[PDB]
Design a protein around this motif. Structure first.
Motif, PDB file in Angstrom:
ATOM      1  N   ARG A 192       0.798  -1.218   0.000  1.00  0.00           N
ATOM      2  CA  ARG A 192       0.000   0.000   0.000  1.00  0.00           C
ATOM      3  C   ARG A 192       0.834   1.273   0.000  1.00  0.00           C
ATOM      4  NH1 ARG A 192      -5.638  -1.170   2.095  1.00  0.00           N
ATOM      5  NH2 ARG A 192      -5.604  -3.369   2.732  1.00  0.00           N
ATOM      6  N   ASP A 193       2.139   1.179   0.236  1.00  0.00           N
ATOM      7  CA  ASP A 193       2.960   2.367   0.406  1.00  0.00           C
ATOM      8  C   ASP A 193       3.377   2.949  -0.944  1.00  0.00           C
ATOM      9  OD1 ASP A 193       2.764   1.789   3.122  1.00  0.00           O
ATOM     10  OD2 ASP A 193       4.853   2.341   3.510  1.00  0.00           O
ATOM     11  N   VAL A 194       3.757   4.227  -0.915  1.00  0.00           N
ATOM     12  CA  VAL A 194       4.272   4.887  -2.108  1.00  0.00           C
ATOM     13  C   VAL A 194       5.690   4.403  -2.374  1.00  0.00           C
ATOM     14  CG1 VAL A 194       4.776   7.100  -3.187  1.00  0.00           C
ATOM     15  CG2 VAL A 194       2.809   6.878  -1.659  1.00  0.00           C
ATOM     16  N   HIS A 195       5.964   4.042  -3.624  1.00  0.00           N
ATOM     17  CA  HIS A 195       7.269   3.531  -4.001  1.00  0.00           C
ATOM     18  C   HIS A 195       8.024   4.565  -4.833  1.00  0.00           C
ATOM     19  CE1 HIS A 195      10.283   0.573  -5.495  1.00  0.00           C
ATOM     20  NE2 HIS A 195       9.973  -0.054  -4.374  1.00  0.00           N
ATOM     21  N   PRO A 196       9.358   4.591  -4.749  1.00  0.00           N
ATOM     22  CA  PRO A 196      10.121   5.545  -5.571  1.00  0.00           C
ATOM     23  C   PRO A 196       9.890   5.388  -7.063  1.00  0.00           C
ATOM     24  CG  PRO A 196      11.487   4.728  -3.798  1.00  0.00           C
ATOM     25  CD  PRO A 196      10.202   3.945  -3.726  1.00  0.00           C
ATOM     26  N   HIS A 235       7.098   4.912  -8.445  1.00  0.00           N
ATOM     27  CA  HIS A 235       5.806   5.490  -8.800  1.00  0.00           C
ATOM     28  C   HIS A 235       5.941   6.864  -9.441  1.00  0.00           C
ATOM     29  CE1 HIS A 235       3.201   2.883  -5.852  1.00  0.00           C
ATOM     30  NE2 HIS A 235       3.963   2.160  -6.651  1.00  0.00           N
ATOM     31  N   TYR A 236       7.107   7.500  -9.321  1.00  0.00           N
ATOM     32  CA  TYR A 236       7.332   8.848  -9.828  1.00  0.00           C
ATOM     33  C   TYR A 236       7.006   8.939 -11.314  1.00  0.00           C
ATOM     34  CZ  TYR A 236       9.656  13.421 -10.245  1.00  0.00           C
ATOM     35  OH  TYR A 236       9.938  14.751 -10.461  1.00  0.00           O
ATOM     36  N   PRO A 244       0.610   9.791  -6.453  1.00  0.00           N
ATOM     37  CA  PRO A 244       0.809   9.384  -5.057  1.00  0.00           C
ATOM     38  C   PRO A 244      -0.230   9.918  -4.083  1.00  0.00           C
ATOM     39  CG  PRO A 244       2.259  11.193  -5.577  1.00  0.00           C
ATOM     40  CD  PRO A 244       1.558  10.842  -6.864  1.00  0.00           C
TER      41      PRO A 244
END
Ligand SMILES: [Mg+2]
Ligand SMILES: [Zn+2]
Ligand SMILES: [Zn+2]
Lengths: 916, 239, 128, 286, 446
Positions: E21-25, E27-28, E33
């Motif tokens: 569920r967390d934002v990943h690098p 994802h940029y 986000p």
């Protein structure tokens, strides 16, 4: 209808047959053309009852006069159709089948009773191996597992003397052959003989089971089913729909499967079939019975059309959606409503705003009754028409009905008992409910879309209970800690704080006034400002330990606003209460002191007046927020420049191998933390004060009137930590794994972040949101467990003869006194004496309820250890005594008998569980 | 921690590294040796039993050889299970331990809750007892029975001046303590309906209507608040 | 969609019936003689157990049950013209073809929407 | 057609949402020096703790844009010549610190300029991209162009009394939204209706004229209060006591608030199911 | 544009951990986000970025500008998450010159999943825009960089629950993405070919196509029929209104009609309100809002809602059902709004309890007590073999009748009102064809 207890035991075939009203013999439900029950089917009217009130199936008898006739043609009794919810049937099984509950539910009862492994029993039951039932020529003994090849070898050599069978019949014979008393004797002897502890434990379990069977009266062979009961048809409905569709329960399909396989087994047994096919049919019948009783327990669950498993009998009574939790411990109720809630700033603490349409719908039978009494309507239908047309007299009748008729307001989730309170309704227009602002904290409700439920008590006892217990005016102290639950916040706090501030050179400074009324007159006419320092003649009263009040007049140094505020303070409080800048804590102390000195009704009146005054003067203040109210310190750039220079110096020191990477990273973190602290200090120093010219023309310093600073300082909303993000620095952000990034966010929300900073900041926001979304289920589960374990504890005695207790002392960790003695002994009852000759202590006799005065007396002298009674050391069977519990925290006096303290304790522990 | 720590505390979960405690007073000594066993033969000041003990060899032992210890002393310091505290130092010690452990977690976040609620929860957690040696009483040895039943049996056995039973007190988690009540209806409505119903049917139990949940289920007045007088009158009439 | 074990046992009973009525002097193998008995038992079991309620009872309905599966080619309902073509070959009326067409596509919902409500429960209306 | 009323939900584009609480008469609203009142009043307390300053910046920029539009409207009402409108609109479009957009009105006919001015008399639209938005100094410059205070705060008067508020108040224009949560679709009440087939309990949902659920937590709260009679009333005569509810209705119609409770039907259903499981359970008399 | 991790072959809401569920690098530029639901589906449902595409294998990629010898070359490459980890990519905020060189010696860049400060000679790629990280919904929030992430998420979630009003109002402060959203949604009418508006109406626009865009054998006219007051999936109103005048020249891609929540081709979800920030006598307590009566008088937040009701006549065991205007046990007052076919007139105002479609059903045998039967005989009313089963307005519902649809079986013969409806449809088709016929015959005669 006046039972005293509930009993549970095993069911014999005779009992099951006595339950039933007939035998179900065909796997048919209804005819497709005419929706009539098939004869001798799962819905047969002859067995379960008529489908219509006082009618038979064919239609010969169609009246109540034929109350007890059984029709000669159809055979259907002429009774009420509700009997189909109560009449059970039965199915005669061609071969015995085992009950899956007494087999697969660990520990297995059949295996423990037979002292056989569960795997061998499973193999025998599902026709995979043989078991010896009686001895032959001593080569094979009882309960020996013969494989098919071993059975073939044994039969040809030993002849017919030995017996070996397959399926549930062999296990039934084994269970019937046992005698329990001799087994108990042998187990007792060898238990007394054995030395291994594990054998002792196993044998004491076995002996417990055997003695349970002996004492209960159940027979061991009743765990193998020979007669199968049938649920009444109305509990497994089958209703037709429009487009040729039907809605049905899975129990019908399971029963049909069982009946089909039983009938096929009977047909095969009457056809002189080979043994293998009968064996297969018996196995399938056993599987069908197991699926009916409990579907998903042994193997693959029987599924339906949607590939979903069929719902069995066991699934009906277990789980969150079972009978208990869904229908017995909670239900949907009549005479209830629901609407969005808005704020009513004019209501008194005991009033709520109820829409007229909602009240009209909720109070219909009362309006009908009062319409019939006045003679305006003779029938119920006429009153219904009058109400539907909404004539003017209906409104007067409703106004009379709702007078002194409280209603209950509830907001989900209910975490503690303050989530349900009683109010006196006030009819309003619109469709929204109006809520008093002071109960929002108790309800944990905000006006951004929340909904609340309304319930109407019906009987006289319910109304009296509501008035005497659940009224909002009766619930002002928290039951968990005894602190007041109604605390002014937000606009009221800001209004009072702005009212009670002072300025050095305000208009009208220096005057001498006759009293607060003159100050109000001066303020309303614009001659003097609220912040002017003046002298006012003030009269204050005080109790003198005799029950009367003694006036005392003098001249005080105060402000106009404080003098105006003094007019609402009740008689009996010192003027020092309001002679200062009042924050949230000051207002809470005001309310607590008023409650301590004067009582409850003056406290309620004072709270209402405080709310009104706070709202009025907050409105008059005209506080706002602008982009200029967030002052950025002028030294920010310089501090950031030094921090970057030091970071670069550390990096250069690392480039030459003098320092390792980890120490460099730690030093960079420390440098950035120091820089952030410096920036925050500079920001707060700049924002704290302002300059102003006094009457002499020279500059002076005073507390600032910045809107953001005023809001933060008054405690209405905000804190320094958010002002740091607003005008200072955001700080250091953490990685999703939990590590700290080397570079912090040097910008603030006024300047605006760039893409990288915002992307970095999103991580913590998402993590916090996920944690908040996920912790509620764990909190609820813990609360449920606590409530279930503690639900049955009630105060049952006034006093118990114990003398013991526990030692209460202050707790200190790291040299800091975390909790003092007064807050740990307030409201308790002393187990022993306190006078203690030698320590010059206070004379406190045993069994003394420690009041606030006794707490003060213990505080003044040097006492550090007192014994108090506790519920753990109580000597009362099935409950606790009042003295060992102490003070009712919600009321203030000793707790009365018949109070459910376990539920209160569980709720108090579980309510703050979402703050961790 | 936070909520998980409170849940662990209230469920009486044993720590993975229990601290060894002095089961009885006496001079400690080192005995035999095995693959991974270091004996703790102890010579009592007045007794005779040299009670040995199991100690994994990787865990440092914080007692020398040949000195005397008192009951409740700590050996190989670390987290301590409440079971040992209850067994050795008594009831008040484990009560204080649980109260302080919960109050630290609640104080870290600035939440104020009175101690009597936690004391009530502990009292509910301390409802069982096993008969060690029964004398004049008709109680089997090694069985788990209700503590109040033992108290009543001893009190009625004080008539004619006989000898009561000897027992030790148990500590159970909230789930297991709630599942071990004398009413099968409440236990079935709480959790594990199949097992509770099967055991009750096998044992042939009967359930009187005493708790709040049972009366709520059957739709009667709860025996608390305004129904306490009604229940007391019914009990008086039955008596 | 019926269990395979149930279908096998239904055929086993049909096999026994053919064995009891076998004449060896005819000269044909039992495999060819028993194929009519085994498939007759399976067909009768499918009719009574395909749905919770029997779909085909009369003579005409049974003929349409096993023929509409193959005759139907495109999803949806038959037009007016296609009804006579089906009815003419099978010797059935137009009413039977439409009636069995509805029975084929009916999907039975499970009990868990205005069908959960008891229609004789409103006591307030009865009092009035 | 649905009109707004108390209970409806309104919100902005910055996460600020709220419920309408009161419709105020026009003469009771705060007004400025020129007598024009405000449309909506919001609590300033919400902004600091939630840290959404974009709404304040948008308010300031909207006030600047509306000032520009008001000046254009004032020019239009006086029937001024096209050249002055061209000059003023070019001045408005040329403001900014090195912006990429270039608008040359010299390539516009008179009719095109007239149409553009007509479309601009209600306010000049302004585009501010995310992470590339307008600076505060640009906002103050546009405020200066519109003959408006550079601080964004003005003096207001209380409509009910005419007295001046003691401190300046931030006044401007913000874009508001009406969300699909209408009190018309959320208000519901029930006296008595139909019941379920099996449990004989009221259904749920407004569309089914159902009742509210009195769950386990509410039962716990009632037990904590000690109101046994209220609990028994909620458990038997209101939900699933078939004879009890009918007798209660008849008694209430006759002005006799008396109750005769019985046994809930769901307990009988549970007993029947447990008996169907092959287990003998019964109520023992005495 | 929604991307979900649930469904067949996906995860489960109850069996999902924190890591997924967390934002990943990575994802940029690929997954927004800040746009996600706030409930238990917080980390499992995402939104596609503005510039994100999918690779030929199905992997998300983003565009970047290539820099060579310190000069940005204005050529764009799409890089997947694997490729972009081996490069030095500069931020879009790096100010440049006119000819394309970095102003500062050191430029902030991303590399190997982390950000640091790099010299100008180590840079390989650069972002194309400052909008690359946010989604469509998040790019419509002015001054987003001054907002906290949580409130930005709440605003993004709330922006798509707005209900269109009676009249659309452009936002005075926007971000510049309104035109693209409005055009690409498809709710507006867009001219396919350029030309001149020949005919304009409240529900019809005719465009005379330029001869340079015509085909050799066509009349060269485009006809746009607008949808008027139709029901949506959420029981709202869908309506189109023209935004062009007679004789106006149009070009390809221009907007001819405005859809719901659209103003002159720009997205318009709300109204501009004059707002003051101050407490007022406690009516602003806890996020409450105080509204002046002038807003109500001007109908600035008035909305139209459309509801649909149906009546079905079936076959029963006793007999078929009939739709008729003859209903027993009801007076002529109720039957006033019905027509001769038993269907309410179009344009009638109705409230709860009113009859819309009349229907009767066979009833069969009944049982009556002798007293009631004698009362019925005394009153003289006869016994009927039918029971009223008409379609009535549900209680609490009012409104105006704006449309009626009648469906009949092929074998059954149509009634009068369906005939009128089909005549109206045939008239519309006849006019549409007559336009072309007239223009072509005029050309032939010329
Ligand atoms: Mg809320
Ligand atoms: Zn009959
Ligand atoms: Zn006591």
């Amino acid at each position: 209808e006046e039972f005293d207890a509930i009993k549970i035991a095993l069911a014999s075939p005779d009992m099951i047959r006595s339950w039933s009203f007939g035998e179900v013999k065909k796997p048919e439900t209804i005819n497709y053309r005419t929706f009539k029950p098939e004869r001798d089917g799962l819905f047969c009217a002859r067995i379960f009852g008529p489908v219509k009130d006082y009618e038979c199936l064919c239609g010969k008898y169609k009246r109540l006069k034929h109350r007890g006739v059984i029709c000669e043609k159809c055979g259907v009794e002429v009774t009420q159709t509700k009997v189909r919810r109560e009449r059970m049937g039965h199915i005669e099984l061609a071969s015995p089948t085992a009950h899956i509950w007494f087999l697969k539910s660990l520990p297995s009862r059949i295996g423990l009773l037979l002292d056989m492994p569960l795997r061998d029993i499973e193999r025998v039951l599902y026709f995979e191996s043989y078991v010896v039932i009686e001895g032959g020529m001593t080569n094979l003994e009882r309960q020996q597992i013969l494989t098919e090849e071993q059975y073939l070898d044994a039969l040809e050599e030993f002849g017919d003397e030995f017996d070996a069978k397959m399926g549930a019949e062999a296990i039934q014979a084994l269970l019937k052959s046992m005698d329990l008393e001799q087994e108990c004797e042998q187990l007792r002897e060898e238990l007394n003989e054995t030395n291994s502890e594990t054998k002792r434990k196993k044998l004491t379990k076995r002996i417990k089971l055997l003695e349970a069977f002996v004492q209960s009266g159940n027979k061991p062979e009743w765990m193998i089913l020979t007669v199968l009961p049938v649920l009444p048809p109305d509990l497994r409905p089958l209703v037709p729909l429009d487009g040729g569709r039907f809605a049905t329960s899975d129990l019908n399909d399971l029963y049909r499967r069982v009946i089909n396989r039983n009938n096929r087994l009977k047909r095969l047994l009457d056809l002189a079939a080979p043994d293998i096919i009968v064996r297969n049919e018996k196995r399938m019948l056993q599987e069908a019975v197991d699926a009916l009783l409990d579907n998903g327990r042994r193997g693959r669950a029987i599924t339906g059309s949607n590939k979903r498993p069929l719902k069995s009998l066991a699934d009906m009574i277990k789980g969150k959606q079972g009978r208990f939790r869904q229908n017995l411990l909670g239900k949907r109720v009549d005479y209830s409503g629901r609407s969005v809630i808005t704020v009513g700033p004019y209501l008194r603490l005991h009033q709520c705003g109820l829409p007229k349409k909602m009240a009209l719908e909720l109070f219909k039978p009362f309006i009908y009754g009062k319409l019939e009494l006045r003679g305006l309507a003779t029938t119920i239908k006429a009153a219904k028409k009058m109400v539907e047309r909404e004539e003017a007299v209906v409104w007067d009748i409703l106004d009379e009905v709702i007078r002194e008729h409280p209603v209950l307001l509830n907001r989900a989730p209910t975490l503690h008992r303050l989530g349900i309170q009683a109010f006196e309704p006030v009819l309003i227009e619109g469709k929204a409910i109006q809520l008093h602002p002071l109960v929002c904290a108790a309800y944990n409700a905000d006006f951004d879309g929340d909904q609340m439920a309304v319930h109407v008590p019906l009987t006289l006892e319910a109304q009296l209970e509501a008035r005497a217990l659940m009224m909002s005016t009766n619930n002002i102290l928290s039951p968990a800690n005894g602190e007041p639950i109604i605390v002014p916040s937000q606009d009221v706090v800001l209004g009072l704080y702005y009212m009670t501030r002072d300025c050095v050179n305000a208009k009208g400074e220096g005057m001498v006034l006759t009293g607060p009324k003159e100050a109000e007159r001066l303020y309303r006419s614009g001659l003097a400002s609220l912040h002017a320092r003046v002298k006012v003649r003030i009269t204050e009263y005080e109790k003198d330990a005799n029950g009367e009040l003694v006036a005392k007049t003098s001249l005080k140094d105060t402000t106009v606003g404080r003098a105006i505020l003094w007019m609402i303070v009740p008689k009996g409080l010192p003027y020092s209460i309001v002679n200062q800048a009042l924050g949230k804590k000051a207002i809470s102390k005001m309310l607590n002191t008023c409650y301590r000195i004067l009582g409850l009704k003056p406290t309620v009146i004072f709270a209402d007046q405080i709310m009104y005054t706070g709202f009025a003067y907050a409105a008059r203040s005209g506080a706002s927020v602008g982009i200029d109210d967030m002052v950025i310190p002028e030294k920010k750039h310089e501090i950031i420049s030094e921090a970057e220079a030091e970071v670069a110096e550390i990096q250069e020191q690392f480039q030459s191998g003098l320092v390792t990477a980890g120490e460099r990273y730690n030093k960079v973190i420390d440098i950035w933390a120091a820089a952030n602290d410096r920036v925050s200090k500079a920001m707060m120093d700049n924002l704290q004060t302002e300059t102003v010219i006094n009457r002499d023309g020279q500059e002076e310093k005073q507390v600032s009137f910045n809107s953001i600073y005023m809001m933060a300082d008054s405690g209405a909303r905000g804190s320094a930590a958010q002002i740091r993000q607003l005008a200072g620095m955001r700080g250091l952000m953490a990685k999703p794994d939990g590590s700290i990034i080397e570079t912090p966010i040097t910008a603030n929300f006024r300047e605006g972040l760039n893409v990288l900073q915002y992307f970095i900041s999103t991580h913590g926001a998402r993590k916090g949101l996920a944690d908040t979304a996920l912790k509620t289920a764990n909190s609820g589960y813990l609360t449920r467990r606590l409530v279930d374990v503690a639900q049955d504890l009630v105060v049952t005695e006034d006093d118990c003869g114990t003398h013991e207790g526990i030692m209460m002392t202050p707790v200190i960790e790291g040299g800091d006194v975390k909790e003092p003695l007064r807050d740990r002994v307030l409201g308790r009852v002393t187990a022993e004496d306190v006078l203690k000759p030698g320590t010059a202590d206070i004379l406190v006799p045993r069994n003394t309820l420690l009041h606030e005065q006794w707490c003060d007396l213990l505080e003044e002298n040097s006492v550090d250890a007192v014994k108090v009674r506790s519920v753990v050391s109580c000597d009362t069977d099935f409950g606790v005594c009042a003295h060992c519990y102490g003070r009712d925290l919600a009321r203030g006096h000793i707790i009365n008998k018949g109070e459910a303290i376990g539920v209160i304790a569980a709720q108090s522990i579980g309510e703050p569980g979402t703050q961790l | 921690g936070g909520l998980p720590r409170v849940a662990d505390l209230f469920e009486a979960r044993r720590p993975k590294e229990p601290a060894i405690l002095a089961e009885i007073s006496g001079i400690v000594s080192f005995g035999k040796e095995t693959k991974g066993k270091r004996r703790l033969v102890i010579t009592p000041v007045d007794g005779s039993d040299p009670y040995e003990e199991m100690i994994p060899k990787w865990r440092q032992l914080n007692v020398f050889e040949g000195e005397r210890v008192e009951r409740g002393d700590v050996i190989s310091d670390g987290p301590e299970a409440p079971h040992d505290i209850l067994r050795l130092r008594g009831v008040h010690a484990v009560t204080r331990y649980i109260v302080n452990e919960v109050q630290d977690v609640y104080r870290l976040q600035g939440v104020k809750i009175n101690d009597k609620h936690i004391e009530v929860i502990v009292r509910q957690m301390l409802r069982k007892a096993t008969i060690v040696n029964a004398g004049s009483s008709d109680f089997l040895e090694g069985e788990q029975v209700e503590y109040s039943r033992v108290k009543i049996a001893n009190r009625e056995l004080e008539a004619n001046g006989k000898v009561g039973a000897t027992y030790s007190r148990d500590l159970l988690g909230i789930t297991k303590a709630s599942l071990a009540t004398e009413s099968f209806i409440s236990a079935a409505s709480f959790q594990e309906t199949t097992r509770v119903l099967t055991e009750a049917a096998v044992a042939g139990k009967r359930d009187e209507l005493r708790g709040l949940k049972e009366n709520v289920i059957v739709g009667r007045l709860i025996p608390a608040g305004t129904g306490y007088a009604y229940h007391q009158d019914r009990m008086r009439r039955r008596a | 969609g019926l269990p395979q074990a149930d279908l096998i046992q239904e055929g086993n009973i049909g096999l026994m019936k053919a064995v009891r009525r076998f004449n060896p002097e005819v000269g044909v193998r039992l495999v060819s003689f028993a194929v009519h008995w085994i498939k007759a038992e399976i067909h009768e079991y499918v009719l009574r157990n395909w749905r919770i309620v029997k779909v085909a009872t009369t003579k005409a309905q049974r003929k349409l049950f096993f023929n509409l599966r193959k005759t139907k080619q495109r999803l949806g309902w038959f037009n007016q013209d296609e009804v006579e073509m089906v009815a003419r070959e099978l010797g059935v009326t137009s009413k039977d073809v439409r009636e069995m067409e509805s029975r084929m596509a009916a999907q039975d919902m499970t009990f868990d929407v205005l069908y959960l409500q008891d229609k004789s429960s409103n006591f307030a209306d009865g009092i009035e | 057609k649905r009109r707004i009323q108390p209970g409806d939900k309104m919100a902005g584009r910055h996460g600020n949402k709220g419920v309408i609480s009161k419709i105020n008469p026009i003469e009771d609203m705060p007004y400025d020096e020129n007598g024009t009142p405000v449309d909506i009043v919001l609590n300033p307390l919400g902004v600091p703790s939630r840290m959404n300053i974009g709404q304040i910046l948008e308010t300031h920029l909207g006030m600047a844009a509306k000032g520009i539009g008001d000046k254009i409207n004032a020019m239009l009402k006086q029937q001024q010549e096209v050249a002055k409108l061209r000059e003023f609109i070019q001045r408005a479009y040329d403001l900014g610190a090195d912006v990429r957009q270039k608008v040359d009105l010299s390539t516009f006919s008179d009719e095109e300029v007239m149409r553009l001015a007509e479309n601009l008399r209600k306010g000049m639209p302004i585009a501010t991209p995310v992470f590339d938005g307008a600076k505060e100094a640009e906002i103050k410059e546009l405020l200066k162009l519109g003959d408006l205070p550079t601080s964004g705060q003005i003096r207001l008067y209380d409509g009910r009394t005419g007295e001046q508020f003691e401190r300046p108040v931030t006044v401007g224009y913000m874009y508001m939204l009406k969300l699909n949560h209408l009190v018309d679709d959320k208000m519901h009440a029930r006296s008595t209706g139909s019941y379920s087939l099996v449990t004989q309990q009221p259904l749920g949902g407004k569309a089914q004229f159902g009742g509210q659920r009195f769950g386990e937590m509410e039962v716990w709260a009632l037990e904590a209060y000690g109101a046994a009679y209220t609990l028994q009333e909620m458990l038997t005569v209101k939900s699933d006591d078939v004879n009890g509810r009918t007798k209660m209705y008849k008694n209430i119609v006759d002005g006799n608030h008396q109750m005769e409770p019985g046994m809930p039907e769901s307990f009988n259903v549970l007993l029947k199911e447990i008996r169907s499981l092959g287990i003998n359970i019964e109520l023992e008399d005495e | 544009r929604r991307i979900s991790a649930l469904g067949p072959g996906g995860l489960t809401r109850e069996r999902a951990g924190f890591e997924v569920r967390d934002v990943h690098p990575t994802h940029y530029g690929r997954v927004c986000p800040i746009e996600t639901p706030e409930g238990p589906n917080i980390g499992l449902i995402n939104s596609l970025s503005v510039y994100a595409q999918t690779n030929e294998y199905g992997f998300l990629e983003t565009p970047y500008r290539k820099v060579t010898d310190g000069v940005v070359t204005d050529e764009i490459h799409y890089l997947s998450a694997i490729e972009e980890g081996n490069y030095v990519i500069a931020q879009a905020n790096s100010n440049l010159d006119e000819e394309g060189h970095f102003v500062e010696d050191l430029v902030t860049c991303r590399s190997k999943g982390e950000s640091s400060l790099f010299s100008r000679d180590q840079v390989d790629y650069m972002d194309v825009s400052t909008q690359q990280v946010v989604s469509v919904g998040a790019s419509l929030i002015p001054f987003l960089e001054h907002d906290d992430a949580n409130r930005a998420l709440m605003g993004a979630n709330m922006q798509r629950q707005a209900v269109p009003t009676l009249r659309a109002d452009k936002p005075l402060v926007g971000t510049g993405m309104e035109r693209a959203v409005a055009v690409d949604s498809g709710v507006t009418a867009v001219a396919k070919r350029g030309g001149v508006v020949q005919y304009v109406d409240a529900s019809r626009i005719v465009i005379k196509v330029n001869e340079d865009e015509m085909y050799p054998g066509e009349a060269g006219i485009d006809i746009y029929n607008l949808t008027k007051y139709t029901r949506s999936n959420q029981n709202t109103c869908i309506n189109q209104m023209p935004c062009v005048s007679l004789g106006e020249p149009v070009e390809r891609g221009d907007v001819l009609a405005d859809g719901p929540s659209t103003d002159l081709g720009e997205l318009a979800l709300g109204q501009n309100m004059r707002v003051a920030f101050m407490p007022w006598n406690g009516y602003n307590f806890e996020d409450s809002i105080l509204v002046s009566e002038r807003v109500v008088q001007e109908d600035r937040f008035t909305t139209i809602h459309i509801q649909e009701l149906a009546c079905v006549s079936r076959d029963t065991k006793l007999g078929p059902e009939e739709i008729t205007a003859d209903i027993p046990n009801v007076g002529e007052a109720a039957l006033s709004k019905l027509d001769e076919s038993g269907i309410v007139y179009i344009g009638a105002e109705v409230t709860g309890g009113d009859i819309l479609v009349g229907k009767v059903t066979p009833k069969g045998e009944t049982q009556l007590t002798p007293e009631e039967k004698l009362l019925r005989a005394i009153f003289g009313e006869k016994a009927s073999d039918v029971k009223d089963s008409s379609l009535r307005v549900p209680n609490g519902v009012s409104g105006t009748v704006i449309d009626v649809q009648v469906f009949t079986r092929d074998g059954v013969e149509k009634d009068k009102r369906a005939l009128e409806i089909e005549e109206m449809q045939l008239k519309q088709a006849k006019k549409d064809l007559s336009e072309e016929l007239q223009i072509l015959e005029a050309g032939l005669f010329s």
